[PDB]
Amino acid sequence: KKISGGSVVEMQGDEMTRIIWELIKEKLIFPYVELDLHSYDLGIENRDATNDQVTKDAAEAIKKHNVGVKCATITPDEKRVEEFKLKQMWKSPNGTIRNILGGTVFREAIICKNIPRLVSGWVKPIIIGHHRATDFVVPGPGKVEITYTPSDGTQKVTYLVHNFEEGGGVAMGMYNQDKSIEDFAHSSFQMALSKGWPLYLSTKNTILKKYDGRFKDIFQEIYDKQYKSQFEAQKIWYEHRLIDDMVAQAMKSEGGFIWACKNDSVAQGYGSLGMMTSVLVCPDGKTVEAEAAHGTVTRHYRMYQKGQETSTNPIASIFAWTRGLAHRAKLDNNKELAFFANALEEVSIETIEAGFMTKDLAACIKGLPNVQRSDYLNTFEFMDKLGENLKIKLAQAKL
Amino acid sequence: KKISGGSVVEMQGDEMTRIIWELIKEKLIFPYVELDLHSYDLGIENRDATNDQVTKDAAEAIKKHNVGVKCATITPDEKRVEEFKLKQMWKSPNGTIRNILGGTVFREAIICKNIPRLVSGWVKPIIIGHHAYRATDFVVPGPGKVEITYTPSDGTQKVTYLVHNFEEGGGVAMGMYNQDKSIEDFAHSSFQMALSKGWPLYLSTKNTILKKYDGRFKDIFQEIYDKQYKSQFEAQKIWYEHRLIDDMVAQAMKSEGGFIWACKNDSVAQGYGSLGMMTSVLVCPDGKTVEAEAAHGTVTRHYRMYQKGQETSTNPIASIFAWTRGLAHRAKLDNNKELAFFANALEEVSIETIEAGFMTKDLAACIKGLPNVQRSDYLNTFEFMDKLGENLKIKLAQAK
């Protein structure tokens, strides 16, 4: 019999990632793992047909069952509205899910030794996690003020942002709740423990002494109170850094740390965004949603619609599953599932490291103008190779 | 019969760059160029001894004489205070100078054909300038409305926007602003930088998210372009256009380079050889005043090796191009053809020397990879400077 993987929430998506998603389930997951699968179709046509109710249900299912794996979906714009004759310009599914669940998005690369990187010294992953606008034009002279009116009726506070004495300009207001900062802290500490690396927070608290100082203070208070003992047990630490110092140190590091950032296209140089997953980590320590860091790869899908050959990287999508299942295994103390998830990840890394890869990675190594057809495998060929290697890997582990 | 170079403000600095700075002056500049030199020692000990007055005098000298060339300097932190027994944690001299001069900092690489880059198609420089910046931030003790309001001086209206209704508990809030003048100065510097070089200009913004804040950058650039610069741009076969950040990178990654890039919000630039292959030039909006320096620090790790008598290989290219781009600007202001020629020739020699396979360790490591670098693949700081000195003499001899 297969591995009993338990309860997993699955979200089907759009275009090229939809094709790859089904191949991942068919060739890599279903042949080895049985799931109590809570499956939701977040394809654009179904979201339209259900008036986006399917997206809300999916979010609630993740809250209920703790483990979510999601395929990339189309975020509608005016162009998509015309393409699919949509009823409305539906909100980003990711945005709707994030609002219901809360949490912090962490991005982790899939490390392959033969794939060029920004700093050659980076041998371990650098897992980065990021935390309303209210801006307006100032047409002419006048005061911009920002006020705080306590809910308890005590005297309101008025700060002068700027008195425009001559000419116009622009002004802006921003905020951050302590609760959100607390969630951000908890998620970051939990992430550092689960992966087994040190955590760093970066802020500009020298300039924004009160705004960014709150982030520094809250992280320290929660660290010293709730996480310091557990960190020291694994030979791990937490320290605050200034953003300028943090980047300079990271560029001369070996990697292998969590970077909580207070504020994507840089990371695409590492092969592509096909080598980056995006995991939402909720502050409860229980709930996770995993997906690829890239979109639906529309350009590749158009070629697929015409019957032309495609070479789309399934790694990020594959690692959405493995990091989803790894969390599932951790929650249920499921040693068999834990091993399988690891095995699939290693198989994927090994296959690329042995010279079998999709065009994006071949282009990163050799340069796009220099890439020939013999340097890479198409989408189907690469999936077949992974499946063959997966079978061989699992047979070896049975000894 | 050396070249009469005119008035230049020069700032000496610290550690490894200080040593390289003097080599450049000794071997590359002074044998061929005489200057009415306004020299200021911004070494950390002298800044401390003068209570940072030298830094302020240096800034005022640049404002007066229009041309500054600056060596990298130590910015004090806690460790430096203890190292040099400092009186105070003195501010960044770069920060002090920028506050007095104003302007926008543009970063330009030194292009060598045998040095790998992000996109092999890049043959021309992509010169990026960021908008230079206080805000009013505060603690929100508990629940309640945080609102931001505008009241024109004429009293004809009052607009109030909800920043956030704090319901759960406390947190933080802040107000930020920008005067049109600051945006206007950022535009003028960008257009003047584009005219000084032979390149088109592009402004990039996040106009999708903050439609109004970034919208006024887009509008002011376009207005100033049409009223004051368009005909000069058309006269030099160049243009100005606006882009969104995500579109600008895509165009940049498929282009051959060769454009100015105004950006409203660095480390990825280190991949191209090193920070030794990039300058930082503060361009004031008046078009006259510039301050040039290397886009790296004092290279402390190399200085420590030098103090122990160990061999060093520090790239002087950025420091050299601070001088050449500084002197090129001096020449432009004074209509000095001989100085203009010298500046360009020194740049050519520097590029030609590297392209012929004579380079410091950082560039050899960038090409081959650090673990594959042998001693025969690169030259010493001093060997490289000597090699540049020899090629410079030959370059200038053949011209005469």
Ligand SMILES: NC(=O)c1ccc[n+]([C@@H]2O[C@H](COP(=O)([O-])OP(=O)(O)OC[C@H]3O[C@@H](n4cnc5c(N)ncnc54)[C@H](OP(=O)(O)O)[C@@H]3O)[C@@H](O)[C@H]2O)c1
């Ligand atoms: N749910 C999400 O996480 C998410 C995030 C962003 C966007 N989207 C959605 O995705 C749709 C298309 O967005 P987009 O095309 O701008 O972004 P994208 O789907 O990430 O594709 C952008 C480009 O990056 C490269 N690329 C990305 N993923 C790749 C992979 N797995 N293998 C090989 N190359 C890859 C391709 O470059 P080449 O063209 O050079 O091959 C591709 O054309 C949009 O409707 C958008 O709403 C979804």
Ligand SMILES: NC(=O)c1ccc[n+]([C@@H]2O[C@H](COP(=O)([O-])OP(=O)(O)OC[C@H]3O[C@@H](n4cnc5c(N)ncnc54)[C@H](OP(=O)(O)O)[C@@H]3O)[C@@H](O)[C@H]2O)c1
């Ligand atoms: N005035 C300024 O513009 C400025 C700017 C930044 C920093 N600083 C000051 O400089 C001091 C040291 O800063 P830092 O060491 O953090 O940064 P840095 O001086 O720029 O050097 C950092 C590292 O980058 C590499 N590098 C930089 N310039 C190089 C060159 N010309 N040739 C070869 N390699 C080069 C070296 O790497 P390897 O170690 O791998 O050889 C070096 O250790 C600090 O006191 C800081 O205040 C000044």
Ligand SMILES: C[C@H](O)c1cccc(NC(=O)c2nn(Cc3ccc(F)cc3)c3c2CN(C(=O)c2ccc[nH]2)C[C@H]3C)c1
């Ligand atoms: C030469 C190559 O083609 C190339 C060129 C230009 C850029 C890249 N991209 C990266 O290597 C890359 N960029 N980022 C984004 C980032 C960079 C610098 C920052 F200060 C903050 C964020 C990241 C990575 C890699 N990466 C790894 O953790 C990681 C992959 C393997 C070893 N470690 C995740 C992430 C940190 C590649």
Ligand SMILES: C[C@H](O)c1cccc(NC(=O)c2nn(Cc3ccc(F)cc3)c3c2CN(C(=O)c2ccc[nH]2)C[C@H]3C)c1
């Ligand atoms: C393979 C090599 O080791 C390597 C790996 C990873 C990164 C690099 N870095 C660069 O080549 C580089 N990065 N930046 C920063 C930047 C990149 C992309 C953006 F959209 C915005 C900023 C820049 C450059 C080069 N460069 C040139 O202008 C330029 C060098 C030659 C031809 N043109 C200045 C600057 C633009 C190199």
